Design an enzyme around this catalytic site. Structure first.
Site, PDB file in Angstrom:
ATOM      1  N   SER D 142       6.933  39.266  37.109  1.00 56.59           N
ATOM      2  CA  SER D 142       6.611  39.141  38.570  1.00 56.59           C
ATOM      3  C   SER D 142       7.892  38.737  39.217  1.00 56.59           C
ATOM      4  O   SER D 142       8.813  38.245  38.531  1.00 56.59           O
ATOM      5  CB  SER D 142       5.622  37.966  38.708  1.00 56.59           C
ATOM      6  N   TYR D 155       1.497  29.778  37.050  1.00 53.49           N
ATOM      7  CA  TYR D 155       1.856  31.174  36.987  1.00 53.49           C
ATOM      8  C   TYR D 155       3.403  31.401  37.080  1.00 53.49           C
ATOM      9  O   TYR D 155       3.917  32.184  36.312  1.00 53.49           O
ATOM     10  CB  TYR D 155       1.208  31.825  38.223  1.00 53.49           C
TER      11      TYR D 155
HETATM   12  N1  LIG Z   1      -0.988  42.183  41.692  1.00 51.76           N
HETATM   13  C1  LIG Z   1       0.255  41.722  41.924  1.00 51.76           C
HETATM   14  O1  LIG Z   1       0.737  41.562  43.095  1.00 51.76           O
HETATM   15  C2  LIG Z   1       1.078  41.391  40.789  1.00 51.76           C
HETATM   16  C3  LIG Z   1       2.453  41.107  41.062  1.00 51.76           C
HETATM   17  C4  LIG Z   1       3.321  40.783  40.012  1.00 51.76           C
HETATM   18  C5  LIG Z   1       2.860  40.760  38.711  1.00 51.76           C
HETATM   19  N2  LIG Z   1       1.500  41.003  38.478  1.00 51.76           N
HETATM   20  C6  LIG Z   1       1.089  40.927  37.081  1.00 51.76           C
HETATM   21  O2  LIG Z   1       0.517  42.198  36.799  1.00 51.76           O
HETATM   22  C7  LIG Z   1      -0.392  41.978  35.669  1.00 51.76           C
HETATM   23  C8  LIG Z   1      -1.677  42.707  35.954  1.00 51.76           C
HETATM   24  O3  LIG Z   1      -2.284  42.111  37.111  1.00 51.76           O
HETATM   25  P1  LIG Z   1      -3.154  42.885  38.173  1.00 51.76           P
HETATM   26  O4  LIG Z   1      -2.729  42.507  39.515  1.00 51.76           O
HETATM   27  O5  LIG Z   1      -3.256  44.268  37.825  1.00 51.76           O
HETATM   28  O6  LIG Z   1      -4.519  42.138  37.989  1.00 51.76           O
HETATM   29  P2  LIG Z   1      -6.053  42.562  37.683  1.00 51.76           P
HETATM   30  O7  LIG Z   1      -6.793  41.386  37.803  1.00 51.76           O
HETATM   31  O8  LIG Z   1      -6.365  43.778  38.433  1.00 51.76           O
HETATM   32  O9  LIG Z   1      -6.013  43.051  36.180  1.00 51.76           O
HETATM   33  C9  LIG Z   1      -5.897  42.038  35.093  1.00 51.76           C
HETATM   34  C10 LIG Z   1      -6.275  42.840  33.834  1.00 51.76           C
HETATM   35  O10 LIG Z   1      -6.184  41.809  32.783  1.00 51.76           O
HETATM   36  C11 LIG Z   1      -7.434  41.772  32.075  1.00 51.76           C
HETATM   37  N3  LIG Z   1      -7.625  40.509  31.536  1.00 51.76           N
HETATM   38  C12 LIG Z   1      -7.848  39.280  32.175  1.00 51.76           C
HETATM   39  N4  LIG Z   1      -8.006  38.275  31.304  1.00 51.76           N
HETATM   40  C13 LIG Z   1      -7.852  38.823  30.025  1.00 51.76           C
HETATM   41  C14 LIG Z   1      -7.916  38.276  28.736  1.00 51.76           C
HETATM   42  N5  LIG Z   1      -8.180  36.944  28.530  1.00 51.76           N
HETATM   43  N6  LIG Z   1      -7.687  39.130  27.753  1.00 51.76           N
HETATM   44  C15 LIG Z   1      -7.486  40.456  27.943  1.00 51.76           C
HETATM   45  N7  LIG Z   1      -7.431  41.016  29.154  1.00 51.76           N
HETATM   46  C16 LIG Z   1      -7.602  40.165  30.177  1.00 51.76           C
HETATM   47  C17 LIG Z   1      -8.434  42.116  33.157  1.00 51.76           C
HETATM   48  O11 LIG Z   1      -9.690  42.500  32.563  1.00 51.76           O
HETATM   49  C18 LIG Z   1      -7.743  43.288  33.811  1.00 51.76           C
HETATM   50  O12 LIG Z   1      -7.783  44.477  32.998  1.00 51.76           O
HETATM   51  C19 LIG Z   1      -0.612  40.481  35.507  1.00 51.76           C
HETATM   52  O13 LIG Z   1       0.281  40.004  34.462  1.00 51.76           O
HETATM   53  C20 LIG Z   1      -0.045  39.949  36.821  1.00 51.76           C
HETATM   54  O14 LIG Z   1       0.495  38.645  36.669  1.00 51.76           O
HETATM   55  C21 LIG Z   1       0.639  41.330  39.506  1.00 51.76           C
END
Ligand SMILES: NC(=O)c1ccc[n+]([C@@H]2O[C@H](COP(=O)([O-])OP(=O)(O)OC[C@H]3O[C@@H](n4cnc5c(N)ncnc54)[C@H](O)[C@@H]3O)[C@@H](O)[C@H]2O)c1
Ligand SMILES: NC(=O)c1ccc[n+]([C@@H]2O[C@H](COP(=O)([O-])OP(=O)(O)OC[C@H]3O[C@@H](n4cnc5c(N)ncnc54)[C@H](O)[C@@H]3O)[C@@H](O)[C@H]2O)c1
Ligand SMILES: NC(=O)c1ccc[n+]([C@@H]2O[C@H](COP(=O)([O-])OP(=O)(O)OC[C@H]3O[C@@H](n4cnc5c(N)ncnc54)[C@H](O)[C@@H]3O)[C@@H](O)[C@H]2O)c1
Ligand SMILES: NC(=O)c1ccc[n+]([C@@H]2O[C@H](COP(=O)([O-])OP(=O)(O)OC[C@H]3O[C@@H](n4cnc5c(N)ncnc54)[C@H](O)[C@@H]3O)[C@@H](O)[C@H]2O)c1
Ligand SMILES: [Cl-]
Ligand SMILES: [Cl-]
Ligand SMILES: [Cl-]
Ligand SMILES: [Cl-]
Ligand code: NA
Ligand code: NA
Lengths: 260, 260, 260, 260
Positions: D142, D155
């Site tokens: 991130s 986080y």
């Molecule tokens: N959305 C953003 O703005 C953003 C920005 C930077 C980084 N991220 C990172 O991107 C990654 C994905 O996030 P996202 O925004 O797509 O979120 P999201 O919530 O849409 O997806 C999270 C995914 O992780 C799975 N998950 C959650 N807990 C779990 C567990 N204990 N074991 C296995 N799977 C699990 C969920 O079922 C889902 O498939 C994360 O690491 C997040 O920190 C997101």
């Protein structure tokens, strides 16, 4: 205490450099000051260093945008002091405009002063420090040596350049008793910032103090200016034995600017 | 001078934390020490702080790998001192192995101590500092909070985590009179490093001092160790007024490690 | 695919820039090349772009150490291409010496080409890209825009400057369909590096390939050179839609140099 | 094209990981997906990968907050695919609160998933990649692996940890045909962000789209979300030959967040 030490502070007739020179004189160093200003004010500053703090102080006028004048200023400063132990490369200017309207002459002037003078002053001071086995080169960079803002192309480029040059100077002199570090301040309310507060106040139609609060809030999470006295304190720390193995790094006093 | 101030240094029965506690007591602070060791050595350290420097000193044994024990240690420390102005989150461990052989229990122990204890200690100290409007949280990270080396997955992860946590703590407390910064040392010759020098000496078939020179040359351009006393000096600087607007940043004392 | 796009690559008669221009032509862009060299080799390079890849290619000779010549080169390039969508600011020189012996003229030449030409080329290209609502400015910095090495004061300063300038360009054009990013390569075996391998081979009394291995081992953990074709691939990625929100950043292809 | 390659994407039943898995399948890779959700939706996602893109796809349910379950998931994934060439460590959670109110259980859950699962998944995958002499580990960090924001202690700590762990993994595997890099996105409008937009909308009394604009304006200079498809494109680039010497670094797709 820096009793006995011999310091040079460029751009020390105003602002941060004036406070640098005062804090180094309070610690016991003899000081060469430099910069533009009214001759009566500069001579009161020079004589005040001597009469308040009991050190020797010299003013050497040199426009450090010229390479040879910068190298000749360091030689004259070392001859005045009888050595050169601490060099604070502080003089700098600002100009704000977007890149496609940024005057070519202002790019060249900010690169000349804010970056190339740091190179020419370091090059002229290093042989003196290498022969004695001790030195401090303290470069005044900025949070804009680590991150950017709009409308500051030349100054951000130059300050990033200073942070890189600081690293090279430290590596080439590693273990020789010479350290080089960059103090990276956030906003300090000097004339260089007061012009930018006035521009914000005209753009927004607000009084000057509301404009200073807006300038702070956009960048500096503490919502307080860094002071020149705090920066002088940091330079005294860098000059101390506790900082003998601090070299090649940045010391950010910026109210949280670079944490976000 | 920190006369009157109330400090806590975790992991202060050895190494860097012991020197932290000494330098803070020399500056006038009352000090809570903590960590493992021989009870006779710990009590001589505690009584020495009082008899040399005229402050009050307390030893609180707590294994800070446990969350609740860390939060309860801060409460006990504040009750001993009658407040809490400076918290130095210093306790840490090391273990070296490549990732695919890195013991799961060693990952959990290094994350618990080197990262999570910094969170739990900060969380318990902050309300005390917020109520008084003044505080210093000084986290001891590492150059390995900014860059990596092989075979140190857990420790590099944890120390990078500490640098991120330091930034958040600073931002959440910006302008409240509370700063949070991370001291990032390069090599310091404590027991945590002496084990790694001994491992190099066995791997290469060389005496211990030739191994210490090899350990330095690979990472630290000055070819000199950082000392615990220098780090204590940096913590005293961070605790000073000159550092009131230094927050959310790293202070690298690393002999040039991160400049290259 | 960049079918239809109009690209300019400075310093594309050798080395990395030649591979930039080839990869952009293979993707479908028309290309302006630039740089010094033998006229017969430059014309074979220009005609080869057209006959292999079916695009239009133009050679514009301009010494980009001159500001006005750089701004006039961008105007001539846009007139040749009928627009300007991708600018790759690649031309650069090196000179190694310690700071106190570093020739003043070599400092000025490396700042002029490696930093100021990036400013003047960006300033002249931006209005074209702003009017169309789409652009890519790809600056070729170096790992030495993020860290330093000895004996490279000017080049490290300039490359750090390029990384800062890249950030400002990105911020001033944020959301306008224009991105600016810096590719930061580690060692690539071009003539600029082959001179440094030859210097190592003379210093150590070893053959050229043993010297190339030593040059790699000191800095680049993969122990393999980055290739010009890989860098061309990175520029094609930066020019793609997947990179529409990649702006103001560095893309390090450096074999692990900056990870330690 | 990644024809023939065998990929695993953790947390690929939603959000960014779902788009990762789609882009890798479109490039020709067989894919293991993972994560929570409705079984009918997960099976439609799995079967869609096969019927649209002609690859093999498997869903393996594993809660990756458990170490042993993560290591067993990688073994099961490699057995399903008949190998393991690309591992995308993507699953993550968020919780916002200031440090002194941050639930201890939420700290432990975010460290467990967002940091420790990346370690356990890498440790289990590396021997497979080392035996074949080729691999890609792509960690989804991130902008909060490089800078901080308030109320995100766990986080930010975890994501900084991931950036450090990425560096160690790259260094330990340097030159072995295995790279490890961290994609560092800015805001992406997934459920993890939509909760934070809804919280802003309640705090300010504004509609959801005005709240999404406020969330962007505070951090992301482009004022546009990064898309999951763009991030999938970046993972395909990291998996390509052009990225063979990109290792140990961060690839920021963040709309300028980290440039200021
Ligand atoms: N959305 C953003 O703005 C953003 C920005 C930077 C980084 N991220 C990172 O991107 C990654 C994905 O996030 P996202 O925004 O797509 O979120 P999201 O919530 O849409 O997806 C999270 C995914 O992780 C799975 N998950 C959650 N807990 C779990 C567990 N204990 N074991 C296995 N799977 C699990 C969920 O079922 C889902 O498939 C994360 O690491 C997040 O920190 C997101
Ligand atoms: N004020 C801030 O918020 C701030 C923040 C970060 C860094 N800085 C840096 O601090 C340094 C000092 O700035 P300041 O705010 O005190 O500004 P200032 O304008 O108060 O002082 C600048 C000093 O430089 C001198 N000077 C200007 N041109 C010169 C030349 N050609 N040769 C010799 N001396 C010259 C001036 O006479 C004066 O003494 C500059 O490098 C600036 O970039 C300032
Ligand atoms: N020595 C170095 O080169 C070096 C470099 C950078 C950072 N550091 C950091 O400096 C800090 C201090 O390390 P050091 O080198 O002085 O090591 P050390 O081993 O000398 O001291 C560690 C201290 O932590 C205490 N401790 C260990 N486990 C504990 C636990 N579970 N609870 C409470 N206390 C515990 C020990 O008893 C001791 O007082 C550590 O965070 C280390 O990561 C050390
Ligand atoms: N080779 C490396 O290891 C390496 C690593 C990191 C970054 N770089 C950067 O990559 C860029 C290209 O370098 P390279 O290694 O391909 O070097 P090179 O010497 O092969 O090519 C330099 C190109 O710049 C041209 N050039 C030189 N002076 C010029 C001038 N005044 N005006 C116009 N063109 C001029 C040359 O004619 C040639 O086309 C440079 O910016 C360099 O700093 C190189
Ligand atoms: Cl800005
Ligand atoms: Cl290493
Ligand atoms: Cl070096
Ligand atoms: Cl914030
Ligand atoms: Na480094
Ligand atoms: Na920032």
């Amino acid at each position: 205490m820096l009793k006995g030490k011999k310091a040079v502070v460029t751009g020390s007739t105003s602002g941060i450099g004036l406070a640098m020179a005062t804090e180094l004189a309070k610690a016991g160093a003899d000081v060469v000051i430099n910069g533009f200003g009214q001759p009566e004010d500069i001579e009161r500053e020079r004589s005040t260093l001597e009469s308040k703090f009991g050190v020797k102080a010299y003013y050497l006028n040199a426009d450090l945008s010229d390479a040879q004048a910068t190298r000749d200023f360091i030689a004259k400063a070392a001859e005045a002091l009888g050595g050169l132990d601490i060099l604070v490369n502080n003089a700098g200017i600002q100009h704000t405009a977007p890149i496609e309207e940024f005057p070519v002459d202002k790019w060249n002037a900010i690169i000349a002063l804010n970056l190339s003078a740091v190179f020419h002053g370091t090059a002229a001071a290093l042989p003196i420090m290498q022969k004695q086995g001790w030195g401090r080169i303290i470069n005044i960079a900025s949070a804009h040596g680590l991150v950017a803002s709009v409308n500051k192309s030349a100054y951000v480029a130059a300050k990033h350049g200073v942070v890189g040059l600081t690293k090279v100077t430290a590596l080439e002199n590693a273990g020789k008793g010479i350290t080089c570090n960059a103090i990276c301040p956030g906003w300090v309310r000097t004339p260089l910032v007061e012009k930018q507060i006035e521009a914000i106040s005209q753009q927004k139609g607000i009084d000057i103090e509301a404009a200073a609060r807006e300038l702070l809030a956009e960048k500096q999470p503490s919502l307080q200016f860094v002071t020149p006295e705090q920066l002088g304190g940091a330079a005294v720390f860098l000059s101390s034995a506790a900082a003998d193995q601090m070299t090649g790094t940045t010391l950010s006093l910026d109210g949280g600017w670079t944490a976000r």
